[PDB]
Amino acid sequence: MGSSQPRKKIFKPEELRQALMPTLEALYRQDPESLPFRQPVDPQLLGIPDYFDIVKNPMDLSTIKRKLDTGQYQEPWQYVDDVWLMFNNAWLYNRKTSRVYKFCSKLAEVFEQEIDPVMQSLGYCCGRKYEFSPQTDTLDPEPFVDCKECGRKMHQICVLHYDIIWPSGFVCDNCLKKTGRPRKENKFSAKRLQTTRLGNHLEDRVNKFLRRQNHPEAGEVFVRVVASSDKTVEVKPGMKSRFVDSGEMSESFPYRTKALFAFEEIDGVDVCFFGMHVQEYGSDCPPPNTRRVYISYLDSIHFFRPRCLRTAVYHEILIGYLEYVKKLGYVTGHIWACPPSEGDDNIFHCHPPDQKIPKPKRLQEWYKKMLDKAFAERIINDYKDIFKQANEDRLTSAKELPYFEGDFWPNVLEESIKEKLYATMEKHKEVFFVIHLHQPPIVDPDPLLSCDLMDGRDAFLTLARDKHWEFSSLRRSKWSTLCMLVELHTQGQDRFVYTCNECKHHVETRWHCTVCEDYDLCINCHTHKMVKWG
Ligand SMILES: CC(C)(COP(=O)(O)OP(=O)(O)OC[C@H]1O[C@@H](n2cnc3c(N)ncnc32)[C@H](O)[C@@H]1OP(=O)(O)O)[C@@H](O)C(=O)NCCC(=O)NCCS
Numbered sequence: 001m002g003s004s005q006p007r008k009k010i011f012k013p014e015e016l017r018q019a020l021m022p023t024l025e026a027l028y029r030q031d032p033e034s035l036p037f038r039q040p041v042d043p044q045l046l047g048i049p050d051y052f053d054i055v056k057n058p059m060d061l062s063t064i065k066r067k068l069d070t071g072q073y074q075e076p077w078q079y080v081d082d083v084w085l086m087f088n089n090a091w092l093y094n095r096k097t098s099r100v101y102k103f104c105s106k107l108a109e110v111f112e113q114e115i116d117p118v119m120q121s122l123g124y125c126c127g128r129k130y131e132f133s134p135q136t137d138t139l140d141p142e143p144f145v146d147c148k149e150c151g152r153k154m155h156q157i158c159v160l161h162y163d164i165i166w167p168s169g170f171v172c173d174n175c176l177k178k179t180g181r182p183r184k185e186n187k188f189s190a191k192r193l194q195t196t197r198l199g200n201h202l203e204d205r206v207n208k209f210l211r212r213q214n215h216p217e218a219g220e221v222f223v224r225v226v227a228s229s230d231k232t233v234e235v236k237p238g239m240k241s242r243f244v245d246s247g248e249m250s251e252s253f254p255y256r257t258k259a260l261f262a263f264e265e266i267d268g269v270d271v272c273f274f275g276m277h278v279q280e281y282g283s284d285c286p287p288p289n290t291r292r293v294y295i296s297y298l299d300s301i302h303f304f305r306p307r308c309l310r311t312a313v314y315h316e317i318l319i320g321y322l323e324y325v326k327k328l329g330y331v332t333g334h335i336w337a338c339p340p341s342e343g344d345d346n347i348f349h350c351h352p353p354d355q356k357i358p359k360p361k362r363l364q365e366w367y368k369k370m371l372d373k374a375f376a377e378r379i380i381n382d383y384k385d386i387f388k389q390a391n392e393d394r395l396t397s398a399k400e401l402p403y404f405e406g407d408f409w410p411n412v413l414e415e416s417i418k419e420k421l422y423a424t425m426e427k428h429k430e431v432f433f434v435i436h437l438h439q440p441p442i443v444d445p446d447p448l449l450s451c452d453l454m455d456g457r458d459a460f461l462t463l464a465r466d467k468h469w470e471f472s473s474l475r476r477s478k479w480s481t482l483c484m485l486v487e488l489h490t491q492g493q494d495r496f497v498y499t500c501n502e503c504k505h506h507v508e509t510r511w512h513c514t515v516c517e518d519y520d521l522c523i524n525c526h527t528h529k530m531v532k533w534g
């Protein structure tokens with residue numbers, strides 16, 4: 001099998017030895033940790049005939065030193081692969097408690113600190129071996145790209161390369177430094193996602209908050225509504241025969257759902273750190289859901305910089321949301337603060353293994369502090385839990401409880417008719433919040449964004465699981481954000497028509513304003529320099 005690549009970087013044996021072997025020596029210097037690894041494992045000295053049935057490809061320091069002196073290593077990645085094979089054998093065969101397993105983890109920490117600067121001075125991304133997390137014996141490997149000039153294999157996630165953005169292929173950073181040419185701009189950014197009044201209100205609120213709270217590490221935050229659509233929730237069959245047939249409740253309740261995400265600039269690239277679905281029941285929706293908003297789902301990835309401000313910005317985003325719908329005319333908001341089930345991710349496909357998933361008491365304090373902040377700034381008038389509120393203006397019927405898609409209470413009520421209910425309600429009081437924000441109709445000024453990927457939380461989880469867009473680390477979150485944003489930019493389902501903001505006519509050729517969010521004067525006629533678009 002043939003392909004062609006003439007100006008490849010090829011390394012002569014001694015260049016490799018001179019560069020690589022200072023790391024193999026940093027492993028030998030580890031005493032006693034390197035001692036079980038200086039020779040090929042001998043199962044007849046150790047009494048473990050299992051071993052060659054479990055470790056199919058042995059490797060050791062000495063074998064690597066041999067290969068490195070013979071020249072058996074053409075590229076540095078083959079060396080790197082062989083030391084990680086050594087470590088992976090040990091980590092596999094021995095129990096996580098044994099001595100050797102821990103020796104290995106020390107050698108590995110040494111190798112990680114030594115091999116990275118070396119591999120980068122040789123013009124590579126790192127010296128790690130990465131594999132994706134297990135899903136549902138084998139693990140899937142991270143992907144590589146080759147520099148069309150070097151031929152040097154790099155980690156696609158390390159260099160953040162994607163052909164859709166850059167279709168003329170991957171070109172290493174240095175070869176571009178001789179090239180004179182810099183990277184051409186990534187146009188698929190979060191900032192360049194279609195703007196909305198809701199999004200603008202939220203990002204405008206957080207960014208002045210972060211400036212008022214000067215921090216050098218913080219980057220800009222972009223908040224984007226990436227989907228909204230009009231849906232209905234049908235009352236389920238038990239409650240169906242008991243109240244819809246009677247005409248006491250409408251058969252279904254219309255609402256608009258919106259999905260919005262926040263991104264922060266970190267190391268000069270977009271990182272998605274927060275995501276949220278909401279349901280908004282307007283002023284034409286029948287009781288009991290009239291003029292109500294509900295927070296369907298809330299998820300987050302803890303890499304916001306700096307850590308000490310992450311939660312405060314999450315609260316402001318939520319708080320900004322309350323400020324926005326209150327002004328548009330909604331009256332009450334509802335939060336179901338229920339923590340995710342064990343193995344279940346909300347929105348993001350692979351949270352960091354060490355991000356604490358909170359207990360419901362912690363989570364309820366969390367929503368409590370956020371709401372207390374909103375009350376203080378006069379955005380919320382006040383808030384109580386579900387039982388104190390139901391009892392406070394009485395209620396005797398199941399039809400007076402707000403009825404939201406996927407919420408707990410519709411399903412408690414469905415289960416109730418086959419085979420006391422106030423007892424079912426009071427047990428979970430603290431987990432369900434009712435928020436009082438405060439008449440003419442509510443009119444949403446934002447248009448509908450049709451986006452199947454974000455039409456509810458399942459499509460994006462599914463797609464990321466297949467494409468391995470994990471959010472398990474900063475580097476992996478950067479890559480998943482990169483690809484998420486390409487999906488939002490290029491496969492949404494919305495197509496855009498252009499109108500003259502002056503003459504109300506459809507425009508093709510037009511003059512577009514240099515400052516304003518979306519302003520296009522037709523040619524047939526504003527205070528800004530304009531350039532010609534479309
Ligand atoms: C709700 C959320 C956005 C708030 O995040 P947050 O402000 O960073 O705080 P959390 O409630 O996650 O945890 C904050 C602190 O408590 C700690 N903590 C959280 N859960 C813990 C647990 N199970 N045990 C011990 N400590 C815990 C964390 O380590 C963290 O400490 P730090 O400042 O040293 O890092 C986030 O937890 C999240 O995305 N939750 C997952 C899904 C969820 O909330 N459920 C569904 C919708 S509400």
Ligand SMILES: [Zn+2]
Nearest residue numbers: 125126155158
């Ligand atoms: Zn790498």
Ligand SMILES: [Zn+2]
Nearest residue numbers: 147150172175
């Ligand atoms: Zn190159």
Ligand SMILES: [Zn+2]
Nearest residue numbers: 215306307308
């Ligand atoms: Zn700080």
Ligand SMILES: [Zn+2]
Nearest residue numbers: 500503522524
């Ligand atoms: Zn015109």
